[PDB]
Design a protein around this ligand. Structure first.
Ligand code: NAD
Ligand code: NAD
Ligand code: NAD
Ligand code: NAD
Ligand code: ADN
Ligand code: K
Ligand code: K
Ligand code: K
Ligand code: K
Ligand code: ZN
Ligand code: ZN
Ligand code: ZN
Ligand code: ZN
Lengths: 461, 460, 460, 460
């Protein structure tokens, strides 16, 4: 009877449900919250606009929010990241979802718009859950009136947080936000170990290439680049790392990687002469992890070893100059989300040409495009943080507060450490791990409560 | 020159040979020498220093002096001095009071020799400390000296805790820099230094194969992380204990099984609480916490026969060695290696099978049984120390009026720009090449091309 | 052309795109293709082939054809075919009978379609086999065909065992080359292939996080070595079981804890013999043995709820799946992934917590749930296959007098010189540069500058 | 008792304490000691022994004696003796001629003291050798003594090569057991021993950080495999050179870049052939080959300033140290650590930057700068030694009829069943539990339930 959705194939729903039932068993923090808060219905009356990869893991998040009282309207934040069986299962449960794997850019924008509008008019949304900031931007630029009713935004990822902080600095942010990314059980779990799991996964599914013994260049060594570099090194790749941040570069050196630049002496003057052609001519795989623009540029692409794989695991595709490749080189689809890019010219290629690159997911997030992103047991931490953040901001009721109280509360904050610890404890118990309890004397000795928090807010883990 | 006490002054030439090698391994620190030599930013500084008198500390001391400082130096541990390093410093005409194998009485005497010159308080105006013993003695016994001191630069996590307690209680008299929490210290020294030096010390003390054996690491902060890797990389099967669930989550994700010595994780002080099956399979226990009694008497009783026991946290009370001294017979194998015979206190059978091996009498094992962290890692810590000394000395806290002092009294870290400057020199030391952002890229992510590259919230 | 049966011929263009990529990843095999094209050493060869119909096997098949052979092909496992590879081979005019998800009846039919052409035995004169099923069918059901066959080239450990048993019993009718025991096969494919593809298949089937979880690997031969590394490198806590103490020693030294499913290692057939405490903590069990019932009914009953069970040895009887079919309810998650509900046979609760996850119905998991070994590894195995086909075809066993046959009826390996030549091409494929001995150095160690470099005793 | 020469007999108590610990780490060897003590299988054996006089060798010597043998012992390297081990052996009344830091003349004298007792040949009837120097001296200088010798048991790869050359040339006078090629020797000692002890020795000699730096390992046999892992596990970026393409393939698959010191691998003897760009980035070079001049004069000229150079193959001629002695100035840092100044022969500037660091004067670095392999690894090697001595002594070659001698003049290995029995004791030492086959399983794979478990072709 329910028709308020658009997915690839509703008949995938039973398969999706089987996978959701398995995922629930892999997500003890999130399911623990579901069990803890079900009675109290802390999200009763919440109307959440959600924009995040419509995977199985996101399904467990959505059904947790609903189980706690929320209504939601959902879209994916990437054209290739949906798992169609997950979308089907959510739609089959009577939840509005607009998402499929392999959207066009026009379809992507349309799906976000279907969450925002219900029956042609703005939905009475009062909460936002976002990954990367596209939904947040559309609301501020095109639907500013809807933000008058919204209590908060809970933002998943580093890039989205940057965008929020810029808005706050400029006075254009209209509702408070929680930076979910910077929970330790998000940033130092999902961003790092998630990519460790899923980068090599995606490259194998796309190419079935042996990785051992081959040369990789990882651009960036933040949380994603750390995890990515390990994904490849643990397979036996000879990994080199590029960075602009000398502290992150120091970490790469100490971690056993050679730190190099694509450019002579690190200076990117925009000319072919600046490219270290000797270095790039030996690289079999380049992975971008930065959240920055044009870190695998046209001249680097021209210089790469024949038959190198090129992919991006940062949030947005402009890390690699794919526009240059579309303008100048011929694309041969191997299979979905795997293209050979023939450097011999624009139109026409020889089927047996040797001078090509392999691009994964058209430069979009490769882990989600060519595989299934992070595994449930890792996403458990990120998504338990999301639920806690939604509860906190919904309960604070920003949209209803007096102006002076709003002025005090308009901020981008993180969750308290106590809650980060509580999420982590459930994760550890999920592994069968046992956390020791401090004695009262030990807790006094190091100056903490037996119940935590166990570290000062300055601590970096 | 006679204003020193070392084991053997004739070791000085050997020490100098090692200092010359260490300088080549310490580009950040040597770079500071070249950068600041002309300006002499520490001219007039009189620094009381208390930190492990190793070759690495030698290069630190000579850097401070090269920048204009005078110093008076002691070690912060009874077993951590390298006698050739101490000799070389004494031979350069610098007051140093330090040798490997001090008694506790000698340790206290050496600190006192830095504080006093010719029987009266030295006109000290700066403090460099590792662990807080010198800082405590100044506050408790020589409070008048703190009236002239511009600041304290503290090396290690335990010392920082002690400073923060003072600040909370309003008893801290001078500002401090928490040198530990530079990323180029905490996430370099504490982690990778222990990775290098823990397995080193265990091999020197015992020459035991580590591969295939079972280890329990107590703690998974920076030292526990590095320690766990030191052992895992050798092929140990490592289990980790933690009180902090976030650190425990990291251990799980890093590929370790997380266990408690105690049933249900509850340390009720009884033998019944001990997981005897677990402890009876452990070949090596390492404490990394900065806490007290984390390898306790009941754990020691339950350990597998012939297990090795050591501590790499700052102080020896991590292990209940007092219990062992009271109850069990100690057989010295060689210096800093004892068999502890669990058969009783009154002698031992030379062929007894029921013993534990304790390294460095439970004191910092990396420094006690080997040489601590390597020069290229200490480069980062000690470049931060020099910069911290400069920062606080230049700010001249001791010259402000009391109301202005009250506003300026803090425990702070160095600014990120300086942490980055140290890191860059470390990276160039490896032959690493850092990429420069284009103006468009710097705009895109909202940073200067010169840095800093991360918000102060960033955890690396 | 209609002499084939595949899932979907329209997948052929996709398969060809992947073959063109695979050729670039297989320098040893494509080097042989180019080298022997002129000579046509397999002109007149009529090869019955039974081996997983993957993209890699496609490159092998097209190499044999390029060297003059005709072939008729089937897969040696019901789940191992890549349908696009089969399509591409069929589209090239080569008889192939293979698809992913065959029934056992279909599997036997496909082998029979290779053996028969137009309802009568094909005039086969060569056999290429993986695991021995084709070899067995010829000996048992078509013995007259073996009168014309010059040899068998056998890919895998299990098939070689079966050949050696036949030879011992006097029932082997044609000579064979053990391709498995080239170093560029056994110590490449069996080990590093499983390192690549075991974790691959578990991720594709389950998308389970592996880091931090407990695995038990049964066996520590070449496949168990590679499998254990596949899991450990992901951060699993891996325990290893073995019956061979030398292999167990290697596991210990490699950093694994060596355990038995049975108390004191004694499998008496009772539940009381099972180490239920150990098995109750295992999240993943992988069988690697080539043996029977190494993950038995009582082990399955004892495993932790929701454990994954899989087999990467050649045949499914490593795990007692027959017990599971008789007693427990199977819920298909998706193809080649079943939840096995331990609550009973007659239906299951969709929300039951007491289940195991079985991959590929206990068949070779790397090929069943992923794509098996990668091209650049299969390059070594399949270069050896081509060399072995050439050698046995050129020897012409079927034509020799009885006394000469008697001398030649054996199971042999390829010479070390050829193993080295394959390896050299593999190394150059990575961009590796092998040093050439000087004449003095070659004299010093007693080898030719060209090799072979090691005595036949050498184990690598 | 005076029939010995050691550095310092007063080290004996320390040595004994370490022997008591080593016995607890050597369960295979101590198991043989317990098993065979009653039967005294070496009663009447008079063994000339030449092998590194370490604590581990002490346990071997005392096992041979405990089984009835008399021995006369020397070290097979000038730097490998542990003086406390030598002292303890001498203090037990066993003839030993060994100290750390022998001259070449002293080394030859020590071997001669084993051969002669009171100025005339000892009535030796057995030889235990490591590297072949003793074996060579007997054949060249004391051939009459070989008439009464029943056999030689040879520890190491280089010594085995020398024996096989003798056999090929018809100059070998007594049979030998190649102890090296037991799996519990070659694939334990040669590989995992160097994994343990290479990084150990480099740390003790230099205290250099290894993580992040560039290494070149020359060779990828058993020692090169273990060596490469020693460095990679510390975080070095390791490149590997090889002449054997199969070993090079393994290095690639193991995650190393395979390179040559020479452009395109061609060593034409000129400076122009050296890849100066590659060598100018290497911080550490380690030779592992058993070959000559694999780190040659031109390579040494091209290495990065301040690179460490060492050898872990049996003999020092792997590195052209003679070139360095002729041309460059040596500055001793401390024992077994020299800076070699490339500025000229006649003196050096103490602050010169253009030097290399050579460890142990190019002699076996693990034994020279540390203590070699750990007891628990040497357990396997030395259990094999004891078994080999028993076998050859019981065979009584010297006393056999000539036709039987002709058949038995050979170089053989120990049976696989005994290799397995050694391994089982090693595994139990770790607390490992080996599973026992059921009768049906043993039938299925074609072995006895008690083993042996693999055919003699198996490479592990
Ligand atoms: N694919 C996934 O599943 C996933 C998971 C988490 C985060 N993300 C995304 O990944 C990106 C990175 O996130 P993060 O948490 O690691 O951020 P981060 O800020 O921790 O790290 C990014 C790094 O890129 C480096 N960098 C920037 N420009 C560079 C350049 N020109 N060359 C080399 N290095 C350069 C920075 O110095 C920094 O250390 C973001 O876009 C984030 O949203 C994706
Ligand atoms: N030996 C060295 O060279 C060296 C180097 C740096 C620091 N340190 C010292 O090592 C210690 C630890 O330093 P850090 O930087 O790792 O501090 P840290 O705060 O990062 O980590 C200590 C960890 O111990 C854990 N812990 C506390 N009590 C515990 C208990 N009862 N059981 C289990 N875990 C427990 C805490 O949760 C914490 O994660 C300090 O004493 C520091 O001064 C020594
Ligand atoms: N899936 C693949 O791609 C692939 C690749 C190569 C080989 N194989 C197959 O894998 C299997 C193993 O091949 P291999 O080359 O490793 O053989 P192998 O002989 O080297 O190793 C098998 C090991 O199993 C051990 N074992 C036997 N019974 C045992 C038991 N009850 N418990 C514990 N350990 C036991 C043996 O001691 C031996 O070490 C064979 O069936 C082979 O054909 C599969
Ligand atoms: N230090 C120790 O404790 C220790 C332990 C065991 C053995 N050894 C000694 O180590 C040496 C090696 O023993 P192994 O068992 O590894 O022998 P191996 O035959 O297994 O390996 C030696 C390797 O060196 C390679 N090689 C030869 N010449 C080369 C060259 N010019 N460039 C590059 N690679 C070259 C060979 O191809 C071979 O793979 C021998 O001298 C042996 O006696 C020392
Ligand atoms: N080689 C060394 N020289 C001086 N200090 C050291 C050395 N190794 C470790 N340390 C210091 O020991 C402290 C613990 O007391 C750490 O904070 C660390 O910086
Ligand atoms: K997933
Ligand atoms: K040091
Ligand atoms: K494949
Ligand atoms: K030793
Ligand atoms: Zn997003
Ligand atoms: Zn200290
Ligand atoms: Zn097969
Ligand atoms: Zn020797």
């Amino acid at each position: 009877g329910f028709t308020d959705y658009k997915v690839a194939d509703i008949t995938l729903a039973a398969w999706g449900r089987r996978e959701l039932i398995i995922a629930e068993s892999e997500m003890p923090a999130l399911m623990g919250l579901r069990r803890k808060y079900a009675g109290q219905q802390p999200l009763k009356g919440a109307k959440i606009l959600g924009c995040i990869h419509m995977t199985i893991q996101t399904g467990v998040l959505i059904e947790t929010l609903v189980a706690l009282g929320a209504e939601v309207r959902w879209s994916s934040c990437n054209i290739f990241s949906t798992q169609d069986q997950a979308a089907a299962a959510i739609a089959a449960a009577g939840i509005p979802v607009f998402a499929w794997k392999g959207e066009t850019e026009e379809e992507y924008e349309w799906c976000i718009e279907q969450t925002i509008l219900k029956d042609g008019q703005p939905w009475d949304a009062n909460m936002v859950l976002d990954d990367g900031g596209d939904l947040t931007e559309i609301l501020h630029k095109k639907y500013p009136q809807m933000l008058e009713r919204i209590h908060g935004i809970t933002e998943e990822t580093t890039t989205g947080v940057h965008r929020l902080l810029d808005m706050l600095k400029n006075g254009t942010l209209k509702v408070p936000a929680i930076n979910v990314n910077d929970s330790v059980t998000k940033s130092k779990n999902d961003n790092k170990y998630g990519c460790r799991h899923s980068l090599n996964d995606a490259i194998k599914r796309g190419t079935d290439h042996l990785l051992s013994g081959k040369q990789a260049l990882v651009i960036g060594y933040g949380d994603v680049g750390k995890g990515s570099s390990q994904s490849l090194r643990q397979e036996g790749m000879i990994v080199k790392v590029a960075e602009v941040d000398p502290i992150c570069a120091m970490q790469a050196c100490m971690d056993g990687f050679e730190v190099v630049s694509p450019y002579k002496n690190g200076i990117n003057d925009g000319t072919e002469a600046s490219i270290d052609a000797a270095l790039l001519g030996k690289i079999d795989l380049i992975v971008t992890t930065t959240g920055n623009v044009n870190v695998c540029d046209a001249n680097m692409l021209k210089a790469l070893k024949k038959r190198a794989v090129v992919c991006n695991i940062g949030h947005f595709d402009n890390e690699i100059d794919t526009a240059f490749m579309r303008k100048n080189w011929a694309w041969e689809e191997v299979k979905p989300q795997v293209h050979k890019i023939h450097r011999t010219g624009k139109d026409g290629f020889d089927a047996h040409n040797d001078d090509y690159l392999i691009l994964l997911a058209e430069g979009r997030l490769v882990n989600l495009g060519n595989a299934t992103g992070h595994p449930s047991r890792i996403m458990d931490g990120s998504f338990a943080n999301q639920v806690l953040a939604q509860i906190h901001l919904f309960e604070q009721k920003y949209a209803d507060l007096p102006a002076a109280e709003k002025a005090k509360r308009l901020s981008v904050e993180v969750l308290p450490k106590k809650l980060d610890e509580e999420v982590a404890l459930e994760m550890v118990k999920g592994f069968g791990g046992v956390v020791t309890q401090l004695t009262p004397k030990q807790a006094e000795y190091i100056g903490v409560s037996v119940e935590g928090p166990f570290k000062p807010d300055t601590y970096r883990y």
